Design a protein around this ligand. Structure first.
Ligand SMILES: Nc1nc2c(ncn2[C@@H]2O[C@H](COP(=O)(O)OP(=O)(O)O)[C@@H](O)[C@H]2O)c(=O)[nH]1
Ligand SMILES: [Mg+2]
Length: 169
């Protein structure tokens, strides 16, 4: 069956693990060690296609930089997560965008921009500013809450659709 290798990246504390575990296990985790990096796999149906998602929940630095380069080269699509109450996490998106393109040595890399924690009242990044950044990259932007599940399926399924568009060229 078709497999899609997805990689979730973003600053520590933005909800990468919470988003991934909501997609896979359908519950919100209040506490998950920020240093744990692991992969999950789930069979889903997306637009009538039965497919396997293989998702890497990243945790930042690796023992050796060759490990980072390896998962970036093998990953097919990237979910670039910031938190709407953490401006620094939004500014760090520039770094992840650049680093992924550099390792892949490609200008066209399937990517979706995710603004997580949309259930919280505190917001430092308004939607407009994130839409402006996504428009500059030519990629979709989705606001999510790993707590309420709002937008979670859409974020991951939209990324799969971006991969499919990249592949048909
Ligand atoms: N309220 C709220 N809290 C969240 C959300 N996503 C993650 N969190 C919390 O934010 C903290 C960090 O999330 P985590 O998934 O560990 O972030 P990671 O470092 O990117 O993996 C945890 O305390 C989670 O409970 C969300 O959508 N809403
Ligand atoms: Mg984590």
């Amino acid at each position: 069956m078709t497999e899609y290798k997805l990689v979730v990246v973003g600053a520590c504390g933005v909800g990468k693990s919470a988003l991934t575990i909501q997609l896979i296990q359908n519950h919100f985790v209040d506490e998950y060690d920020p240093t744990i990096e692991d992969s999950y796999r789930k069979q889903v149906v997306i637009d009538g296609e039965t497919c396997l998602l293989d998702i890497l929940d990243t945790a930042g630095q690796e023992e050796y930089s060759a490990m980072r380069d390896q998962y970036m080269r093998t990953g097919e699509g990237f979910l670039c997560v910031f938190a709407i109450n953490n401006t620094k996490s939004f500014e760090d998106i520039h770094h992840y965008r650049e680093q992924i393109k550099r390792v892949k040595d490609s200008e066209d890399v399937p990517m979706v921009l995710v603004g997580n924690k949309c259930d919280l009242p505190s917001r430092t990044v308004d939607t407009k500013q994130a839409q402006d950044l996504a428009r500059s990259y030519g990629i979709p932007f989705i606001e999510t809450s790993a707590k309420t599940r709002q937008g979670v399926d859409d974020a991951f399924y939209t990324l799969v659709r971006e991969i499919r568009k990249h592949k048909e060229k």
